[PDB]
Amino acid sequence: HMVVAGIDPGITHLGLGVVAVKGALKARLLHGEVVKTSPQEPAKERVGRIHARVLEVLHRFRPEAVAVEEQFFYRQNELAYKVGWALGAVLVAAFEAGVPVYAYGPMQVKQALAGHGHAAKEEVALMVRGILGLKEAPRPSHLADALAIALTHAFYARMGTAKPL
Amino acid sequence: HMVVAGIDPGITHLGLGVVAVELKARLLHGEVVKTSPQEPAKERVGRIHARVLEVLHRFRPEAVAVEEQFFYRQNELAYKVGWALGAVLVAAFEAGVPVYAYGPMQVKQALAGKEEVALMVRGILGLKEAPRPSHLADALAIALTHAFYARMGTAKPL
DNA sequence: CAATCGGCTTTGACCTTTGGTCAATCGGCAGAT
DNA sequence: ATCTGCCGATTC
DNA sequence: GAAAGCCGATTG
Ligand SMILES: [Cl-]
Ligand code: NA
Numbered sequence: 001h002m003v004v005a006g007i008d009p010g011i012t013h014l015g016l017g018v019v020a021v022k023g024a025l026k027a028r029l030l031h032g033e034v035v036k037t038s039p040q041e042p043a044k045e046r047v048g049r050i051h052a053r054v055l056e057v058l059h060r061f062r063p064e065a066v067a068v069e070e071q072f073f074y075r076q077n078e079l080a081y082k083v084g085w086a087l088g089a090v091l092v093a094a095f096e097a098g099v100p101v102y103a104y105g106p107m108q109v110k111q112a113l114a115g116h117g118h119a120a121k122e123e124v125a126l127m128v129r130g131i132l133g134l135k136e137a138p139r140p141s142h143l144a145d146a147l148a149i150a151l152t153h154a155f156y157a158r159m160g161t162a163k164p165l
Numbered sequence: 166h167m168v169v170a171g172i173d174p175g176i177t178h179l180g181l182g183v184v185a186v187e188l189k190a191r192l193l194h195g196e197v198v199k200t201s202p203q204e205p206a207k208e209r210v211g212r213i214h215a216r217v218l219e220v221l222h223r224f225r226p227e228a229v230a231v232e233e234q235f236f237y238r239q240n241e242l243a244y245k246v247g248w249a250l251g252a253v254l255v256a257a258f259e260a261g262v263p264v265y266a267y268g269p270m271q272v273k274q275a276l277a278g279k280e281e282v283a284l285m286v287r288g289i290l291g292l293k294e295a296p297r298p299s300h301l302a303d304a305l306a307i308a309l310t311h312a313f314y315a316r317m318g319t320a321k322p323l
Numbered sequence: 324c325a326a327t328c329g330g331c332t333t334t335g336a337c338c339t340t341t342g343g344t345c346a347a348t349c350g351g352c353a354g355a356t
Numbered sequence: 357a358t359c360t361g362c363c364g365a366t367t368c
Numbered sequence: 369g370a371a372a373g374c375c376g377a378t379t380g
Contacts, residue, residue, distance in 0.1 A: 234348060236333055243348085
């Protein structure tokens with residue numbers, strides 16, 4: 001039985017999910033959340049709330065690990081910058097919590113969750129509803145990913161191949 | 166007396182300087198924060214946030230000004246600079262100081278018609294030698310660049 | 324309010340009836356004072 | 357220790 | 369040659 005938080009990082013919508021797992025991938029959704037900020041706030045405050053929110057959730061659920069998604073490529077560099085900001089407030093927060101951080105990328109999730117190298121966006125989210133025993137598929141997109149990441153971290157942790165940051 | 170913190174953001178060397186102002190001004194504190202890839206990323210960003218926060222509590226500045234490049238020939242770079250930036254803003258948020266951002270264009274041309282500016286800061290403050298490392302002179306350019314535009318009401322908040 | 328949508332994907336200086344080129348970023352590592 | 361240097365830039 | 373996320377503006 002282990003508690004993983006999963007984060008799909010981004011400055012506009014930040015996916016936040018806590019789950020709980022030992023035999024096959026069977027886990028139970030503890031918390032789900034999407035942090036939203038608008039380009040109307042001073043950046044200090046957009047990333048200021050991101051940090052507060054993750055801290056509350058890390059204190060409340062005392063997980064064993066944070067897992068974040070890491071995109072292998074951003075089309076323009078101001079995207080990578082700002083997604084970078086939000087990972088910063090996350091990193092600071094996991095440091096204040098002493099929770100250790102692991103990052104996986106968009107193909108390690110596919111390889112773990114659907115068992116295939118290239119699953120469909122529909123092919124993973126179904127594998128998530130199953131690992132979680134959930135009525136409907138979880139929404140929005142960014143929260144679906146966040147839960148996928150948390151489960152992908154648990155998959156590779158069961159094989160002792162986890163990727164710290 | 167306008168006291169203004171300047172930052173050259175970066176995950177490996179992060180320039181941090183504080184400056185008070187009366188058409189010129191004096192130096193209050195300087196340091197480069199250093200962190201190494203042998204550290205867990207949570208600890209590198211950790212220290213950067215811890216250390217910026219302390220400076221802001223001490224000197225209670227009226228503005229943090231950070232530099233902001235627009236070119237990065239690779240994404241992995243702009244990503245990690247963002248980490249270190251993010252740690253800053255989290256701290257600026259806690260400290261409650263407003264953040265302002267200037268690009269190298271409005272720093273070069275806010276002070277000198279390349280190295281022509283990096284020497285001017287030795288003057289606009291008053292120093293035997295120009296400052297080292299590079300990253301600290303950058304940090305100090307920025308704090309001045311802000312206070313300059315702060316007097317022309319074209320301060321650009323982030 | 325809260326969600327859905329489509330467009331955008333570095334910027335600037337220089338010279339080269341005319342749109343061409345070119346350069347800047349910084350993080351990891353290795354080796355020396 | 358603290359600095360100076362050169363090299364390399366997305367993955368399937 | 370594909371890959372994603374930010375922003376600004378539009379609805380119900
Ligand atoms: Cl979303
Ligand atoms: Na601000």
